[PDB]
Design a protein around this nucleic acid. Structure first.
Lengths: 144, 150, 129
RNA sequence: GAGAAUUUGGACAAACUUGGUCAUUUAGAGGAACUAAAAGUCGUAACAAGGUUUCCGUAGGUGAACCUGCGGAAGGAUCAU
RNA sequence: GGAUAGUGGCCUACCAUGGUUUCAACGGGUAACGGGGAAUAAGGGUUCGAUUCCGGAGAGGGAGCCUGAGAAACGGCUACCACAUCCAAGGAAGGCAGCAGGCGCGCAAAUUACCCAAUCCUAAUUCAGGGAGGUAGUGACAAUAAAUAACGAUACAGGGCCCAUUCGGGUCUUGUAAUUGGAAUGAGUACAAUGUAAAUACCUUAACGAGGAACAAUUGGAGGGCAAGUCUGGUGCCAGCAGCCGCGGUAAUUCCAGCUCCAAUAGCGUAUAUUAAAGUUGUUGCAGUUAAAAAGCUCGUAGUUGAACUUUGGGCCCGGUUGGCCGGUCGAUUUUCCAACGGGGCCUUUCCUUCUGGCUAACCUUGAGUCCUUGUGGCUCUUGGCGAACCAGGACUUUUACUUUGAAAAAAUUAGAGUGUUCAAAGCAGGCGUAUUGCUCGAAUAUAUUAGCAUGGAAUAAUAGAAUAGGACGUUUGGUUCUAUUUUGUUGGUUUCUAGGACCAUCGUAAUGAUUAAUAGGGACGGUCGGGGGCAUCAGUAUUCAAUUGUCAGAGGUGAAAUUCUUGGAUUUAUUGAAGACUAACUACUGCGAAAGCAUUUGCCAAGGACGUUUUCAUUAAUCAAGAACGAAAGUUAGGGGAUCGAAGAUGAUCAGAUACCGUCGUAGUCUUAACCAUAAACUAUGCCGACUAGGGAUCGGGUGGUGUUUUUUUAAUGACCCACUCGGCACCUUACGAGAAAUCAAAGUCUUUGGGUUCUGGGGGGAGUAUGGUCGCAAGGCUGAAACUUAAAGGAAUU
RNA sequence: GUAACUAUGACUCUCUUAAGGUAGCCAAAUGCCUCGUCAUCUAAUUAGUGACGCGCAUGAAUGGAUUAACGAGAUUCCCAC
């Protein structure tokens, strides 16, 4: 009837060291402490990133769905890693272009895949300074 | 309990409530002390003398009759052995198993129980060192127990 | 070895009062046990108890009235301060009206109600609802 | 009397070369992998006694699952003389 | 010793060998300057703090140094390294992590503005200076307040009511109307004055400024979670949406649109961190038989934890709050009849160790006594001694944790008191009179649970004290080394006396004295008890082979066969002999052992539990990082041995193939000696020590009983076996109130009514028990052991 | 010879007699083509080294693959000279 853990009044060392060890099994803690955000993670553990679009891509959706997901492969200005970002509305692949500048952001799932889209963890929000929403709703026009 | 096994035996001696002598006993402290001392002169130990007095005579317990324990009486008369009983007999049992171990070298049940006897000697020693019944610098190694018992 | 004696005494009283028995036998019986039983007795969670004086730690035979629901020990005797008694009597007891948390105070073994009226504190022993 | 360059040794000590040792970053012809993805080829190993009960440790063999030996376990298909 | 302003291995010389560390030294990392604080909000916490205050550091990187009270200064100098300028080619000048501004870097941040007027600072100093600092500009980082409309009349409706005479008279109200008409205000805009250093903006204001198309409010959504469409047009597994489950494949409430509708609203969404949610880090407070997880098992240091017992009593007065009969009274307050709470004195053997002076107010007492209705009513005052009003010196205290109260705890922040900044976030102002000379309340308080300092308590927890007494106490009495003021007329000396140190030698005084046997453990002892251990012996068939012997056509082996041997008699029969394994039947819900394991016999050597015990020691204990011993099988070395069986391999079947399952052979393989290895579904998939909660057998020990059986040597002394009752421990099993997701259970119960001690392990599934690095090993491998990336489930139990 | 796919590990037959070179290793002192191809060493390398292998004509006591130390052995590079 001891409940495993020590219950001495002089056991604060053990009770603290046991948490210090067993905290590593937590997901949030481990990656905040080992700094996984700053080694892996193309964004280098930041909110957004900028990049120049290499190719237009047609990624095939995962099996229960069927579509062409109109992604864009983009080299990150920040570090030089090449990632694949999704273009976030109907006829926006025709808006972005090849060789243009792009503001990326996470896909709202913190380093995982959003739905059926295989191996896309990022999303285009702006092209050449002007947002991919305003051009879509026909509010702002691309520069030059 | 039984620290060196899974044994849980409760075999013991429930000493009588009477804190005074048995009402049927005569020849008080004087004669019994003389019989204790002359038994210790013959070379028997407090653990044997308490038995001999319970068996052959009417000495139910030594401390209730006299007001003095048996080895406390031997230390009063300066007729106490060099090392106490507990350690003496445990050392004797460690020498017993070890003197057979060197002949019969695959007795891994003997080697196991040798470690048990030896690691019980060491726990006694640490106690008898703390309470100063034994001098410090005292430790049983091997081939020196041969000197301790004889 | 048995690490505490108040522990198994209070447990034994609880295990009996679970089944609605009218008496318990406590084997070890310390002065601390007797003093805890006396504080239980005062508020009326306990009837009378005999102390059989076998030339040893002795034993107790307590008599219950089926009023006591919960009766436990806090094993590690936490150094409580009167600034934080409310944090204990809010975490251990049913709300506020009844029940008592038992402190081994310097003035002696008492409840939180009594320790407040005196304006003194010590450690924690246990509780009774 | 003042007193400049100059220079005699001292400690302070940058900086230079020279190897050393540790850390981080990183190129590499080839080699041996692992995951994923439509399932495309080959069988059908497992789930029923899955058609050889399954599984563990270990040892060997084999296109592939796997197969076989030894010891063990029922989470067995027996809670039985 | 030197040096320093000074202390110091700070430095020098000469010596000694020290110092830190499993209570984590040292080494590595920090996308680390510390703190006051910040976000979240049951409590406990978690995360962060470059940044308005305090401290530390640095001025591209190191080092050096002058001047000075102050610097190892950088808007000072010197050198070197880096980078950089202008050059007339000889030289010269550099240091924005001060303000502004430019590059660059990026997801990511403002004006090369005005001023000393406020806050202050500096100076020879009322004046000068100040990119300190303020003012305006940029400025949806945050924060406060709150416009985007309000009101009737006119036509329709509905909803309470008289009788529902069908009446509705609608006599009141809740709205609907592209009908309608006057009143309102800033949003702007601008004379003005105010503001200000000067201005801008606010505050206040001339004149102008509202009518649906405006002075136009968005942002994200409508299948579920989740408030809100089973409404139209388009697309047709595409385009797409979709945090997640999912929607779209020709009628989509999910796509793109229209129309309605919803949530928040001058904001709303989006991405990434973080807090709650999260009892998914659990101290409060997790989970571990089967869902992830008891570390194969025992020993063991550190660590954590550790039974009981020492003053309990019973009284013998006085004083604090709060309700008490009440108002004892003027809807503001005190008395008893009378309690509760928290206390000091005093003794019941109880002692805060008590001294020398000052202080003793004081009667334990009287120096004359007596102011006086007959009074043990009351003091002008003081012999002998009180001490407890009262220290400041003595001067020794067996020590801690714990808790009480207090002290100093910066401000800002936080909580919070007061106050109409028009309200509020704020601010620390204000308030009220003749408002002519005025007066006046404020700027409180509280937490800062660490450490240090004082303070009271002495319940819980530990430590020592008297054991070869070197124990305690004194009107005991003796010698020593002492020191030491006072008078020896003046200090100085020999021996003094006297006081106070400490030391033994005696004398006494004490209760002539002095420490509990844990249904905790260790050990001894007694008769047992086991298929526990080892070493040597003894046996039994069997299996294979061999020698001989008798028979004359098959035998094997199969679901069926074939390889296989056989007439030179195979298989079968018998008499033997050999070799190496193996311990059948008895053999069990039975035993022993730390686990692995251990079943022929006898002998030897040691051990071990259990029981019994009016023996002994007396806390010696529980669990345990590190560190160790044993550890099936297989496997590896090298020697024997190799009968049987059999990985590999040979080979016959089956097969579609089947280098497998079935058949016949068959190396290695261990069974053995020495040395390794150290893993198993090493399992009861249930850590150990400890306590409590509820029928039958059976192992071992002991206690009673039976005039039971056997017992013969006369009746039997018994003894054993057996029977009944009884316990202690054991391996269990059968029924069940509590527990668990259930299967289920003697613990998996005593668990949101959560705490006996303690060790180990787990945090979705994969990747993966993989890589790497150490470590061990002859090798095979063992121990420790990640991440990238991937995924919405995988899994446990029960139901149909 | 057929076969996923774009180079094929599943089928099929006939065997040079008996077996079809297994584990290994290599342009090796054994590779004709050959100065093989790829990397590396150099400014430049028919050389050296490390890999690749349908190897004219490698290979298991005619021993194969390693291998510390040793060598007046054959070879390549570097520093000193």
């Amino acid at each position: 009837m001891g409940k495993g853990k020590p219950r001495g009044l002089n056991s604060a060392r053990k009770l603290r060291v046991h948490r210090r060890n067993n905290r590593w099994a937590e997901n949030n803690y481990k990656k905040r402490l080992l700094g996984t955000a700053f080694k892996s993670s193309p964004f280098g553990g930041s909110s957004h990133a900028k990049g120049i679009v290499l190719e237009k891509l047609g990624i095939e959706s995962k099996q229960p769905n069927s579509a062409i997901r109109k992604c864009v492969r983009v080299q990150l200005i920040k570090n030089g890693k090449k990632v694949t970002a999704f273009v976030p509305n109907d006829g926006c692949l025709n808006f972005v272009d090849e060789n243009d500048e792009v503001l990326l952001a996470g896909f709202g799932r913190k380093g995982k895949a959003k739905g059926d889209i295989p191996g896309v963890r990022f999303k285009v929000v702006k092209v050449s300074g002007v947002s991919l929403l305003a051009l879509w709703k026909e509010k702002k026009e691309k520069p030059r | 309990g039984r620290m060196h096994s899974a044994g849980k035996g409760i075999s013991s001696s429930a000493i009588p409530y009477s804190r005074n002598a048995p009402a049927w006993f005569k020849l008080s402290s004087e004669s019994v002390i003389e019989q204790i001392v002359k038994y210790a002169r013959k070379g028997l130990t407090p653990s044997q003398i308490g038995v001999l007095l319970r068996d052959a005579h009417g000495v139910t317990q030594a401390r209730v009759i006299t007001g003095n324990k048996i080895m406390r009486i031997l230390k009063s008369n300066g007729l106490a052995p060099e090392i106490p009983e507990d350690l003496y007999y445990l050392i004797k049992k460690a020498v017993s198993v070890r003197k057979h171990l060197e002949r019969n070298r695959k007795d891994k049940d003997a080697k196991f129980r040798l470690i048990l006897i030896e690691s019980r000697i060491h726990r006694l020693a640490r106690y008898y060192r703390t309470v100063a019944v034994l001098p410090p610098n005292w430790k049983y190694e091997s081939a020196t127990a041969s000197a301790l018992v004889n | 070895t048995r690490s505490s004696v108040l522990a198994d005494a209070l447990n034994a009283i609880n295990n009996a009062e679970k089944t609605g028995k009218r008496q318990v036998l406590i084997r070890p019986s310390s002065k601390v046990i007797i003093k805890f039983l006396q504080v239980m007795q005062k508020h009326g969670y306990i009837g009378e108890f005999e102390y059989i004086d076998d030339h040893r730690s002795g034993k107790i035979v307590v008599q219950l009235n089926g009023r006591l629901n919960k009766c436990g020990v806090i094993s590690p005797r936490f150094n409580v301060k009167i600034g934080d008694i409310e944090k204990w009597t809010a975490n251990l007891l049913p709300a506020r009206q009844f029940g008592y948390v038992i402190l081994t105070t310097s003035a002696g073994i008492m409840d939180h109600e009594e320790a407040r009226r005196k304006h003194v504190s010590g450690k924690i022993l246990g509780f009774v609802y």
